[PDB]
Design a protein around this nucleic acid. Structure first.
Length: 108
RNA sequence: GGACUGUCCACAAGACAGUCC
């Protein structure tokens, strides 16, 4: 399966500068393992909250999605979506070009 | 790069202004 790409990286919307890494492993872990845990901010603490979690398999991301997907657990609902790159590259997917030994990003 | 403070906006991978090291 590749119909949304395969990074196993999953977006939780809420956090509300209210809940934390605790909820992250909670919500996401409800139906998977979890190999990485991320909450998104600014200045390393100008300070907001939005969550990213990486799962040992993309299966498990889908699982925690299918489970969660509009449940409610910090005095608010959580939104659960499969995560996508923070900037444009091609459309709906990264789809990188072919390469092997092109010139390194350095010189005189 | 780190710590702070003021602001938009705070649920896609954030940033602005001012300060100190």
């Amino acid at each position: 399966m590749v119909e949304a790409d395969h990074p196993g990286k999953l977006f939780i919307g809420g956090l509300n500068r209210e809940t934390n890494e605790k909820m992250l492993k909670a919500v996401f872990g409800k139906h998977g393992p979890i190999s990485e845990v991320l909450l998104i901010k600014d200045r390393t603490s100008k300070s907001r909250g939005f969550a990213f979690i990486t799962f040992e398999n993309p299966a498990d991301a889908k699982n925690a999605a299918k489970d969660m997907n509009g449940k409610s657990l910090h005095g608010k609902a959580i939104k659960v979506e499969q995560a996508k790159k923070p900037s444009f590259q091609s459309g709906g997917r990264r789809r990188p070009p072919a390469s092997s030994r092109n010139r390194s990003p350095s010189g005189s």
